[PDB]
Design a protein around this ligand. Structure first.
Ligand SMILES: [Cu+2]
Ligand SMILES: [Cu+2]
Ligand SMILES: [Cu+2]
Ligand SMILES: [Zn+2]
Lengths: 151, 151
């Protein structure tokens, strides 16, 4: 798989479409998310592609190397830690990320897992409580979708 | 992955949860679909896990070996051809299929692809027309979802 896509849906107004592309040795993630409150929102890949209980059944961050939570540029981070996306005053967040830990096949594959956008900013593992080291204190799951193979 | 799940949703009342489990060289698919008109409905794995345009962006049947549409028991069939599901008069179909061609890993992996439940019964390629050998005349897609990894 070279291309993947995710449609984000939740119980409120947040929605969006995220695209993933294997380019060279990396993955580029692009798209946009609407309906958000202004400012930063944690944006992560969660382990299970299980939407039977809404976004809750996606489980925790995808973490095959068993590390602590961090920001996308840290060495100590989960594979699913893609940092924050930033919404403007209209509620629109434009997504543009290149990441060196995920991709689309093999052990690090995110195909069949869940993309989640969160209520609050991800503090990138530096909030100083235990929760920070798991979720970055990013709060509740506003919208999510299973990552699928695209044409 | 040895376990998977799919939540079926569409524009109307058809809803359902399908579970997949690896068992030796087989895949056992169980679950139930509700809101269906009594009778037989085609039940296939389509190629893309793209829900950006509802169920229509799922593309055609998963057919990596470019075969003709058939039923589950035939040798000449698509990998995604799982035949038919049958709804009672209450509109409920209990799924219980064991299949040797679909898998949760490797080249014929369905993770990240779309499970589709159709309007009309699958004629299994025995219909007397061209359509029959492509889709089994199952008609419109009532509901679908991306197949994801499950705990
Ligand atoms: Cu998260
Ligand atoms: Cu079909
Ligand atoms: Cu077919
Ligand atoms: Zn994390």
């Amino acid at each position: 798989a070279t291309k993947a896509v995710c449609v984000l849906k939740g119980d409120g107004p947040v929605q969006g479409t995220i695209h993933f592309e294997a380019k060279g040795d990396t993955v580029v993630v692009t798209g946009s998310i609407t309906g958000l409150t202004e400012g930063d929102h944690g944006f992560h890949v969660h382990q299970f592609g299980d939407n039977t209980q809404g976004c809750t059944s996606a489980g925790p961050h995808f973490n095959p190397l068993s590390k602590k939570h961090g920001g996308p540029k840290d060495d100590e981070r989960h594979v699913g830690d893609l940092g924050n996306v930033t919404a403007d005053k209209n509620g629109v967040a434009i997504v543009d990320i290149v990441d060196p830990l995920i991709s689309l096949s093999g052990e690090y594959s995110i195909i069949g897992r869940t993309m989640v956008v969160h209520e609050k900013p991800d503090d990138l593992g530096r909030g100083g409580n235990e929760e920070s080291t798991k979720t970055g204190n990013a709060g509740s799951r506003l919208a999510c979708g299973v990552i699928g193979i695209a044409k």
